[PDB]
Amino acid sequence: QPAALPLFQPQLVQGGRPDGYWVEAFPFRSDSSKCPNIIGYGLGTYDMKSDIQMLVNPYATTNNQSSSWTPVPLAKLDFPVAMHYADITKNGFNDVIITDQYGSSMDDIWAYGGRVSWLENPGELRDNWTMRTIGHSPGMHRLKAGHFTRTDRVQVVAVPIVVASSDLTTPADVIIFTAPDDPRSEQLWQRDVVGTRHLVHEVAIVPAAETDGEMRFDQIILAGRDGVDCLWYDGARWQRHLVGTGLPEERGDPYWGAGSAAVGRVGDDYAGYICSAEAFHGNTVSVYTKPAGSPTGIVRAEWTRHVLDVFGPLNGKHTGSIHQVVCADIDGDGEDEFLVAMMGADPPDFQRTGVWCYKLVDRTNMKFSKTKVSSVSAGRIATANFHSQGSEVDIATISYSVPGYFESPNPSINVFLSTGILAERLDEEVMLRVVRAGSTRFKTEMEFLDVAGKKLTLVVLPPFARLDVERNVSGVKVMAGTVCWADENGKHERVPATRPFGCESMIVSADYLESGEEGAILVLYKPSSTSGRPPFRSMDELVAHNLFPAYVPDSVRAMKFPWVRCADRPWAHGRFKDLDFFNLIGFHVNFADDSAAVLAHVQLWTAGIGVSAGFHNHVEASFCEIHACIANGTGRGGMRWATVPDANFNPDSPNLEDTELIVVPDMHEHGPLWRTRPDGHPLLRMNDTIDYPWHAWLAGAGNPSPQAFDVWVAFEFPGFETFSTPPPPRVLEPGRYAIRFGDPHQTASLALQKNDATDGTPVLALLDLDGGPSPQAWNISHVPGTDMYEIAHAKTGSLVCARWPPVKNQRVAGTHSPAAMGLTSRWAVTKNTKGQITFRLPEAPDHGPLFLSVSAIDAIPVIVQGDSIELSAWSLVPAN
Amino acid sequence: QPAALPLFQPQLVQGGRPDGYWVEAFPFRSDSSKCPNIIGYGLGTYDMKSDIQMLVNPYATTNNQSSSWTPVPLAKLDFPVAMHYADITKNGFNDVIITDQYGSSMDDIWAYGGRVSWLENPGELRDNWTMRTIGHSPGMHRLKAGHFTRTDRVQVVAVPIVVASSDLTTPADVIIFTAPDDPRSEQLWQRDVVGTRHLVHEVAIVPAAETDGEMRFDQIILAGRDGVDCLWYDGARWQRHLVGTGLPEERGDPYWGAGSAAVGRVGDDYAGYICSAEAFHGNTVSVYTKPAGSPTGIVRAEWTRHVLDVFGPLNGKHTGSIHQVVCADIDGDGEDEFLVAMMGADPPDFQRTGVWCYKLVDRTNMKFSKTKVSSVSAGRIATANFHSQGSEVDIATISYSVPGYFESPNPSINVFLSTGILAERLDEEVMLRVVRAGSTRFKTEMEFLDVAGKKLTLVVLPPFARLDVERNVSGVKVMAGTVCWADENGKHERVPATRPFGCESMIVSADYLESGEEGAILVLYKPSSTSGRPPFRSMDELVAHNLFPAYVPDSVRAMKFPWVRCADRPWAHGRFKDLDFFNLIGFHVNFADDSAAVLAHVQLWTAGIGVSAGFHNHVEASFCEIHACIANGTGRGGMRWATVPDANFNPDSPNLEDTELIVVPDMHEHGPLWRTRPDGHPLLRMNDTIDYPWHAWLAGAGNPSPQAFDVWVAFEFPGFETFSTPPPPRVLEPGRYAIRFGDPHQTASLALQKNDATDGTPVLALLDLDGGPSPQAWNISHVPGTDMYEIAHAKTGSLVCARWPPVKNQRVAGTHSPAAMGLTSRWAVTKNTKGQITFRLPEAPDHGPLFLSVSAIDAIPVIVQGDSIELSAWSLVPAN
Ligand SMILES: O=C1CO[C@H](CO)[C@@H](O)[C@@H]1O
Ligand SMILES: O=C1CO[C@H](CO)[C@@H](O)[C@@H]1O
Ligand SMILES: O=C1CO[C@H](CO)[C@@H](O)[C@@H]1O
Ligand SMILES: O=C1CO[C@H](CO)[C@@H](O)[C@@H]1O
Ligand SMILES: [Mg+2]
Ligand SMILES: [Mg+2]
Ligand SMILES: [Zn+2]
Ligand SMILES: [Zn+2]
């Protein structure tokens, strides 16, 4: 399933900065690289030195309460430009390498400038690290650290853009610096010039480790006027591989070739593609591709350049808006997207301000599409997981601001935090916007409420994702998809709602669980010691606490969730006076996509001993409701429903003996209580409300003291199809099959007319001409929380589905536009004593059972009919 | 109807400031006071002077494209503290009055300091205004400008907090300064000391104009150690009126009394209440009240102090978190809420960080409740309409940050913009979160899309609100509530959906329209010249443009809305190939409240000549859909629906003669097309989908060139009850009535048992004992877009409603918890040739017509029955 972009909670790392040029992700220790810091700064001015401020990552430490990024001044430098880092001292701390003394601009280059230097990490978070000089070369513009001719030392490649003021035509030395055995002695680093290039504006590095053995040394990618270029060493010699020339020169315009270039991973190949921005500070985005079946990596292939976008014209000084391109697996599917850092433009224009995120949509043809991620100036981009231990990629940017050239307003640093859940305050209640679990490749955990001895945590899971829980203590309640675990009694599974009137324990009994093909969205009930211990004798004992992560907006963090006694709620209207009966609100969960559709509404309730939460039937508003009890004060509290008809039951003086009880014990959820058609569509009232019998929560009877409160969580789902009444036997495993009709000799198979993907393509029985048309393949699968199945074309995906309306003799077709709740594309299965299978639609109350059937005994068309048992028997051969 | 709080779009006015203390709303001109600027600053330090930066309001000019607040340095001052403004030069520009030279703290008071000075407004937006000295007094802490002993000159009241370092016990002069005839000559201002007070920490002013003639001069309110105090002049003498003492002193604690105080308007009274914060920088909120029926204003009443909140303990230097209280009609109901500026606390704590907004909930008892508006440090608050011409009140804050005392992170200025609509990007589509029109007191306009020669503008209206439109050009489509206009043919009205299969012009033919009792939420189609002119020959001609206001978030502002050809849409699946048939998405409108409920989903469509948007029936997803056509390319395009049953119609090769057509001309909307029960509940399919016959948009037939596109807007509503089939006659005006049964002598009336507000109170016929029980009153009103009515108790509000379920002989009760779509609380009316009225429920298909009826011929109970015509006749007398 194509990977979806994740969501992005923005957060302001540093604001109102004087200026801004550079931002980098800085892992303090060089061993590990999760939750790094950010280092950022600007080019400074003649009046004021630039503070290279290292901002501390607050999420760097778990148990985090801060969102604030603490600024540590690493140093104070005359026009710094570029930087990188590596463990120079070989002590497991990262040391900063930085160039400075550039000049104020390319027409103000410092003759004795372009200094390259390293800042020694002292192992703690004091400011002002001892600085040392690596070396000088006028115009010094970019550098990277790695192992280029030797592995047993830190080496630095450094490259001036020009050598002197306004001189755009003299090329610069590509320089390599080498650590001594003892970098702590103030002395000059060994240097080599390894080529001369014109107007190099970016250096990119491909570590030896990423090349899956191809290269023992680090590869240098240079984006310049000469274009995009690859230099590498092999042990004996330097060689060069031209990737391309980039922008063709125009007359009068000193800039051509490239300003930035990055190497994209695709699958097993670390160089699936090289992306590029042209020229120096240009407006042109392009990508170099190589022919299908090329060798892995850069140098063994010939590269061709295709232009993707030109974001509009250049100004009189022949510049534009693109400062950088970088590569990163944003959506976490194993292919690298690339991000374009937009400086902003003049006049102002959002098309040219922010980050564009390009996604490789078609691997064969190398087609891309761009989405907008952020629309506030990006002078530089840095990527890294900035908030968790998993492999999400967050995006940090610094605003591009240089006085006397181009200034954006409120020059700042913000980071955009990858997440599959977002939290927004409405008023008293909260909005949890969620990704479709189906198409994320990321696990997301967000704690929200600490109540009744439990930490309520909203959790999204990618397909086939594992959640490591606490055996027998942890509990779950699935809201979308399915989860699964196994102990001594085999496999167990949890779906949005169990069997009508059933009861299921929420306690995971294994050390971990796993999500279904469709992933899962769930509430994990974690054990908490900060919210009391049952039994609960008072509401003061059940105070709940606001648990949202430091990185959620403040208005959400500042919210309290009091328990309000139902009698006092605005919707009470004189009702529930004198009842220890309380209610806590509340948490909307809705999909973050363009449907904005509801997943569930959640709120909470408590009942003292002898208390009835009142009988009702939900005529006021439409929902399929499932309760999960957390604490059962008496061991005997649960749900009652009336067995007599609605007319026959007085809700006010309720006769409990026209009622049946389901104890919902500690950490259990119960099955649906609403009325349902035989195959599990709900009954509907005249005002479009899920039809329910009279029902209520009743707490255990007896002495109100000592007190002992029931605590339960309401789950208000929109309509769906549940299980069948009565439950069919299980006569079919899902799997890929051929679906066939007939006997020993004369047989035919179910088929999608000319294998055609279009909605409304006919479905047929194709005679098995022993000439060799070959029987088509069908994927059959169970629908979770039902007793129904669907049949989907192995090849197109098309669902076997009766055309509208499902009556005696309707034609059958393939569709990707099924009706709500699978009304015409889900089937009840039987199996005769022969072994034949039958497929039936949700029975409507007028038309009888209608089966998937042939119509005779060239292609026979397919229909649903009720009349003949013979036409509807099918033999299932396993296919592939 | 109680007024709801409006919504707040936050916006960052200035960030990453060094420090922060003061913020003020500064009207550049002194004539007008809409869209003022903001002036703000901090106390500065010994190293750096404080820039009193005046930030330009970008919304100050209409046709605004900027959100950025341009900083103008007004001056650069040694420890400024407080400020105000007034037109000193009498030239219609506001001049700034400011104190500075305070000292660094109360233990570092400047002996020759406390300077008071004015900055001359030069009539333009250059920086650095000529400064002049008004006068000095050590410790100078607060001041206000007004007319206190004379009207023909600007006067300034100024008050030191202390007179010298750490001296907390010597009180200070309350000083009055007077402009000369010629303030432009550098000379000293005339001064008077008008009293001495202890630790005055706030000055508040009550202009002569607000006192409705009571006071010819301005009233001075002082919050200090002596408490909250009122000094005023009358022409001859000063007098003083003690409002209260405030915090009672504790031993060892130099602070008591008050730190801030503000005067709240209530209705016709400008001093309904005085609110207060205690003590100096304290944690205590209280309010002074006066006895019901007191005279208006402050000095003619005796004031009593009630404590509302104590936000937690004090630190060792006996301080807390509250810096200021102010008053403002936030919700616009004619009563002033008050806001508390929270500095933040230590350790950090949101309860003490931000603004609390208190609302006077009960005028009689003077009860308040607080809501949280913002949760980022507020050192000072300023209120003013910062973005429109109406009377919404926005909230600006500056962070409280003083180094070496208390520092919050990212000291900045933000403003919170009052609005009833909020705009949030989802992905390709937009979320428009809206207030309930019913309970706002503000008109809100937000343009979103410029398309087909129209500016599509979302509009919320308070009840009985007027929208001034362009006669015959402007158009409207109501999504909630009702609008109304009148021309020569009388009154016209527009509701969410007109009569099934009808057609209504959207063109307002008057110069204005007005909203209904329930207000309205609508799309106003404004005339645009930036989006082309019909007829539309190409899609390039119908490019639409993103119109959201500069104050909406950036991601929303940066969005494009392309027209995508339906064939290429993801949901297309081989369908609509080769059809000039396009689609633009999209705009969710949802209520901003805790229900988060849908109002409508909106998207757009176009069809070339001879094009059918395809036949369908909405089995895929549930909605009540209404289309509004903007441009009809042929004059003949519209909606077709099948008249044969669903089985009888082949959607693929559609036989147009089993179809009927409704031309939806230019600027018209049509009536519902879905199937409906006789009183207008929709028919529902087995999968809970609004049941529709086969239907489609078909463009006019004939020559595809010249081209000519239909352009229409889809409105996807959730289920509701529409009009009745067939339409009943109008036999009843709404109004207040007594509802009576019988004949000449023996009569009884409909009544709510013991006038009791509780849900499920019985409804009865009370014998009219001529002793004098007196007949109860009932409000009867039409339900918009239906042909039904409801009966609501004049006194409680309780709806006359049959208990569940509505069958032969059901009991009738009063409720505020009605069922969805009024299923049991809405009535079809008849009137016999006598004049008697009958009330019938939405007829269910089993039980017959059930009428509101008595049950005999002490109180007779009330029921719904079908059997007897006699028991159900009612006589309606007008009541009051
Ligand atoms: O579109 C949908 C399909 O399945 C989900 C649950 O698993 C629904 O809640 C959602 O609205
Ligand atoms: O079933 C339920 C739904 O709403 C009821 C309100 O009285 C609750 O008591 C209970 O959670
Ligand atoms: O609660 C509601 C009542 O009326 C509105 C329209 O006027 C609805 O759309 C809304 O969902
Ligand atoms: O009635 C409608 C709803 O969806 C259809 C999609 O083909 C549109 O053509 C038309 O706006
Ligand atoms: Mg090191
Ligand atoms: Mg003036
Ligand atoms: Zn990816
Ligand atoms: Zn108000």
Curated annotation (Swiss-Prot), chains A, B:
Optimum pH is 5.8 for dehydration of anhydrofructose and 6.8 for isomerization of ascopyrone M. Optimum pH is 6.0 for dehydration of 2-dehydro-D-glucopyranose (D-glucosone). The keyword Magnesium applies. Residues 420-725 are annotated as: Isomerase domain. Its EC number is 4.2.1.110. It holds the Pfam family AUDH_beta_propeller. Its cofactor is Zn(2+). This is Aldos-2-ulose dehydratase. Zn(2+) 1 binds at residues 201, 281, 323.
